From Swiss-Prot:
The chain holds residues 450 to 497 of 1176 of the full protein. Component of the RNA polymerase II (Pol II) complex consisting of 12 subunits. Belongs to the RNA polymerase beta chain family. It is found in: Nucleus. It comes from the Eukaryota. DNA-dependent RNA polymerase catalyzes the transcription of DNA into RNA using the four ribonucleoside triphosphates as substrates. Second largest component of RNA polymerase II which synthesizes mRNA precursors and many functional non-coding RNAs. Proposed to contribute to the polymerase catalytic activity and forms the polymerase active center together with the largest subunit. Pol II is the central component of the basal RNA polymerase II transcription machinery. It is composed of mobile elements that move relative to each other. This is DNA-directed RNA polymerase II subunit RPB2.
Amino acid sequence: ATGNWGDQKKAHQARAGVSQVLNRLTFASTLSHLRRVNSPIGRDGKLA
DNA sequence: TAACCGCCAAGGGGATTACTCCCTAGTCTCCAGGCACGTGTTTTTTTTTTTTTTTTTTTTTTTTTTTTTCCTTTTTTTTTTTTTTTT
């Protein structure tokens, strides 16, 4: 439910965004959300 | 087989006596290197300030806007009331 993939007390060391709310806007949006792949690199890197 | 002994022969040079001479022993007298004393200028040691690289710390990561979801403790020890058993 929360999305933190680990212990509740030690959720700061756990990854966030593994579990997401399913996008029920269209059928195609649901199919795109069911076939999504996420990179573990954070969204602040200057390396391209 | 020639060491050794006996016998004989020959000669060479150290010992002896005398004359000489010359070099050193001895004694003054002047003076100068040999030596006692003081010290040095290089040599080592110690500080002193810098240098140079390594390591650690710290701070940073464009802005604005709109929706959900989950959570906003929890086990663990101590206390306190209740219930049951016994004389």
